[PDB]
C-alpha cells in the first residue's frame, strides 16, 4: 500500500521509492532517492496498521529516538524520519554491500586478517555506542552492514536501550536477539556486557564458520548458552581462541569491556588489513606482499 | 492451495471442505464432512511448506502421536489423519460453540456456578490427561472448546508432552504458552504441575474477568509471574479466592494435584449446574428455582 513517492512535509524533501532490500519485523526496506539531489538512501517503512498497540508504538518510537542521536563511521547513518497516516518512514544510510550475514553465507569461515578487520570495525562502532550509554542488544551478522568499501555499519536499533543511570540493570528485553547473552536468559539484569557477549559469538562465527551455540531447537540453544556449552575447534589459533573465551563467559563481570578489546593480543599482534578488496566477498584473500 | 475435497487413501473416506474456523500456528481449521456418512468434523490442515525443518516436522508428529492416543468426554475427539504431498490433514471432533475464549469476550466475569461448571469439566479432562502421563502445557481459554451442549473439550496438543518415566523433569518447552508456569520461565524443569497452574489462571480469569498477570509487555508479565505478582479482588468469595491461591503458587510442589481439585471446598460446597442453557453464551443465568 506504500506510496511510490515518499514526501516529507517539514523538510520538503521527496523520495522516489525503488528496489526492495528485505523485511525485518514490521519493516520493509527500499532503496529510495531524494528526487531532487538524487542522493540515494535506504528507507525503512513501517505500516501503522501493525502499530495499533501503544507498546508497539513506543518501541518504534524508542528506536528512532536512539538511532537519531547517533553519528559514527561504523553506525548506519540516520538521515531522518517522517510519517503519513498509514506509514512511518525512516531514511537511513544505504549500504550497497548488504551485511556480514550474506558474506558469511558465501564464505563461511574467514581468514584471521579478515576477521581482525571486521571485528575492529564492529568494536569501534560499539565503543561509540557504549560511550553514549546505548546497548544495542542484538549485534549479529545480518545487523552488521557493509558499504561499498566493505566498511562495517552497525544497524537496526530496534532492541537497543539507553542506560539511564549508573549501575542500572535492564530487567527485560522485549525481543528475541540472535546471539543472546546468558544473563538475559536468566533474567538477572543486564547491561553493556551483553554486547561484548554478542561480539564474542560473532568472532567465533567469523573464525569458525558456524555460531558457537547452534542446535535444532532454539530452546536447546538457550540451554546451551545458560550452561556455557560450546567448544572451540583445535585449529583456531590460540590467541584468537583466548579472546573468544574471554568474551563468551557466563559471568558478565568477567568479560572484557568494549574498550579493553582492541588492546587484546588478537589485534595488536596480528596483521590487520587497512582495507579489503571486493574480491573477498567471494574469494579468500591471500594478502600477498607484491 | 488446499484441495476442495480431502481424500484419505487407506480409510477410503472423503471429506468436503467447508467453512473456515480460524488459524493457529501452521494450521487452518475447517468444517469438513465425510462425503459419504455426511458426518461433520473439524479439519486441521497444515501445509508441508511450513514443515521443511525436521524439528517442525517432529512437533507436528508428536502432536498427532499424543492426540491420537486420547479418548475422553472432555478432550477433543481424534478421528484420524492423513497427508498428501503438500498438506497434513487431521480430522477432529467439531465443537459447534467455539471456545471459552469467545464466551469470555462476550461475558467477561462468569457467575460462580458457571465457573464451577466449566472448571469441573476442564479438571476432569485434565485428570484424564495426567492419568495418561500427558501434560498439555498450554491450557487457556481459546483451547477449551465447547460443543453444542456447552461441554468442555480440551484441544490443541501442539505443546503437549509425554512423561516418559517417574520423576522426569521436562527441561524445555518449545513454544510460548499463554498461562505459562513460573518453573517454565525459570527453567528448573517442569511436570504435571504447570497444568494445575494454568487452571488456576483460568479460574481467576473466569471469576475475575481478566487474566491474573496481564500487563502491556509480555516480558513484564513473565516478570510478574516469576515474582508471583497478582492480586485477587476483594469481592471474589473467600473459598474461591482460596482455591485460586492454592493453584497459583510459585512452588510447584505446593500446588494441589489435578486429582485433589474436585474435592476442594470450592466444588463440594457450591452449587454445580448439571448443564447450562445456551442463553448463558450471552446472558448471565440466575439459576432460579422454578
Ligand atoms: C539479513 N540481510 C538481509 C538483506 N540485507 C541487505 C540487502 C540489500 C541491501 O541493499 C543493497 F542492495 F544496496 F546492498 C542492504 N543494505 C541496507 N542498507 C541500509 C539499511 C538496510 N539495508 C537495512 C536496515 C534494516 C533494519 N532492520 O534496520 N534492514 N535492512 C535491510 C533489509 O533487510 C537499516 C538500513 C542490506 C542485509 C541483511
Ligand atoms: C481462539 N478461538 C478461535 C475460534 N474458535 C472456533 C471457532 C469456530 C468453530 O467452529 C464452529 F463454528 F462450529 F463453532 C470452532 N470449533 C472447533 N472445533 C474443533 C476444533 C477446532 N475448532 C479447532 C482446533 C484448533 C487447534 N489449534 O487445534 N483450532 N480450532 C479452531 C480454529 O482456531 C481443534 C479442533 C472453534 C475457538 C478458538
Ligand atoms: Zn524448538
Ligand atoms: Zn514487550
Curated annotation (Swiss-Prot), chains A, B:
A GO-annotated cellular component: centriolar satellite
Modified positions (Phosphothreonine) in chain numbering: 172, 176
Record's keyword terms, sorted: Acetylation, ATP-binding, Cell cycle, Cell division, Centromere, Chromosome, Cytoplasm, Cytoskeleton, Isopeptide bond, Kinase, Kinetochore, Mitosis, Nucleotide-binding, Nucleus, Phosphoprotein, Repeat, Serine/threonine-protein kinase, Transferase, Ubl conjugation
Phosphoserine PTM positions: 65, 99, 231
Subcellular localization(s) per the UniProt record: Nucleus; Chromosome, Centromere, Kinetochore; Cytoplasm, Cytoskeleton, Microtubule organizing center, Centrosome; Cytoplasm, Cytoskeleton, Spindle
Induction line: By growth-stimulating agents.
Impact reported for residue 172 to A: Abolishes activity. Abolishes checkpoint recovery
Sequence segments annotated as region (Activation loop): 156-183
Any one Gene Ontology BP term: mitotic chromosome condensation
Tissues showing expression: Placenta and colon.
Residues annotated as the enzyme's active site: 138
GO molecular function, a single term: identical protein binding
Effect of residue 156 to A: Does not interfere with FRY-binding
Protein kinase domain residues: 15-267
Highest taxon of the lineage: Eukaryota
Keyword Membrane among record annotations: no
Pathological condition linked to this protein in its record: Defects in PLK1 are associated with some cancers, such as gastric, thyroid or B-cell lymphomas. Expression is cancer increased in tumor tissues with a poor prognosis, suggesting a role in malignant transformations and carcinogenesis.
Role noted for this protein: Serine/threonine-protein kinase that performs several important functions throughout M phase of the cell cycle, including the regulation of centrosome maturation and spindle assembly, the removal of cohesins from chromosome arms, the inactivation of anaphase-promoting complex/cyclosome (APC/C) inhibitors, and the regulation of mitotic exit and cytokinesis. Polo-like kinase proteins act by binding and phosphorylating proteins that are already phosphorylated on a specific motif recognized by the POLO box domains.
Family: Belongs to the protein kinase superfamily. Ser/Thr protein kinase family. CDC5/Polo subfamily.
Subunit text: Interacts with CEP170. Interacts with EVI5. Interacts with FAM29A. Interacts with SLX4/BTBD12. Interacts with TTDN1. Interacts (via POLO-box domain) with the phosphorylated form of BUB1, CDC25C and CENPU. Interacts with KIF2A. Interacts with CYLD. Part of an astrin (SPAG5)-kinastrin (SKAP) complex containing KNSTRN, SPAG5, PLK1, DYNLL1 and SGO2. Interacts with BIRC6/bruce. Interacts with CDK1-phosphorylated FRY; this interaction occurs in mitotic cells, but not in interphase cells. FRY interaction facilitates AURKA-mediated PLK1 phosphorylation.
Domain notes: The POLO box domains act as phosphopeptide-binding module that recognizes and binds serine-[phosphothreonine/phosphoserine]-(proline/X) motifs. PLK1 recognizes and binds docking proteins that are already phosphorylated on these motifs, and then phosphorylates them. PLK1 can also create its own docking sites by mediating phosphorylation of serine-[phosphothreonine/phosphoserine]-(proline/X) motifs subsequently recognized by the POLO box domains.
Name of the featured protein: Serine/threonine-protein kinase PLK1
Species annotation: Homo sapiens
Location of this fragment in the whole protein: 39 to 328 of 603
Amino acid at each position: 500500500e506504500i506510496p511510490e513517492v515518499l514526501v516529507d512535509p517539514r523538510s520538503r524533501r521527496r523520495y522516489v521509492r525503488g528496489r526492495f532490500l528485505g523485511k525485518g519485523g514490521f519493516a520493509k526496506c527500499f532503496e529510495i532517492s531524494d528526487a531532487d539531489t538524487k542522493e540515494v538512501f535506504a528507507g525503512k517503512i513501517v505500516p501503522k496498521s501493525l502499530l495499533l498497540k501503544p507498546h508497539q508504538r513506543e518501541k518504534m518510537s524508542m528506536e528512532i529516538s536512539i538511532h537519531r542521536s547517533l553519528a559514527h563511521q561504523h553506525v548506519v547513518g540516520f538521515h531522518g524520519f517522517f510519517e503519513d497516516n498509514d506509514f512511518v518512514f525512516v531514511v537511513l544510510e544505504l549500504c550497497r554491500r548488504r551485511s556480514l550475514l550474506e558474506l558469511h553465507k558465501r564464505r563461511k569461515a574467514l581468514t584471521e586478517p579478515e576477521a581482525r578487520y571486521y571485528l575492529r570495525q564492529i568494536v569501534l562502532g560499539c565503543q561509540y555506542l557504549h560511550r553514549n550509554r546505548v546497548i544495542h542488544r542484538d549485534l549479529k551478522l545480518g545487523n552488521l552492514f557493509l558499504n561499498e568499501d566493505l566498511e562495517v555499519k552497525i544497524g537496526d536499533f530496534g532492541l537497543a536501550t539507553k542506560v539511564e543511570y549508573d549501575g542500572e540493570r535492564k530487567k527485560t528485553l522485549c525481543g528475541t536477539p540472535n546471539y543472546i547473552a546468558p544473563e538475559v536468559l536468566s533474567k538477572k539484569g543486564h547491561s553493556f556486557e551483553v554486547d561484548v557477549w554478542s561480539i564474542g559469538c560473532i568472532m567465533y562465527t567469523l573464525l569458525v564458520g558456524k555460531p558457537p551455540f547452534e542446535t535444532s531447537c532454539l530452546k536447546e540453544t538457550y540451554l546451551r548458552i545458560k550452561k556455557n556449552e560450546y567448544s572451540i575447534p583445535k585449529h583456531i589459533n590460540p590467541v584468537a581462541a583466548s579472546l573468544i573465551q574471554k568474551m563468551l563467559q557466563t559471568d558478565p563481570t568477567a568479560r572484557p569491556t568494549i574498550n579493553e578489546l582492541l588492546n587484546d593480543e588478537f589485534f595488536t599482534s596480528g596483521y590487520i588489513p587497512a582495507r579489503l578488496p571486493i574480491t573477498c566477498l567471494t574469494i579468500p584473500p591471500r594478502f600477498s606482499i607484491a
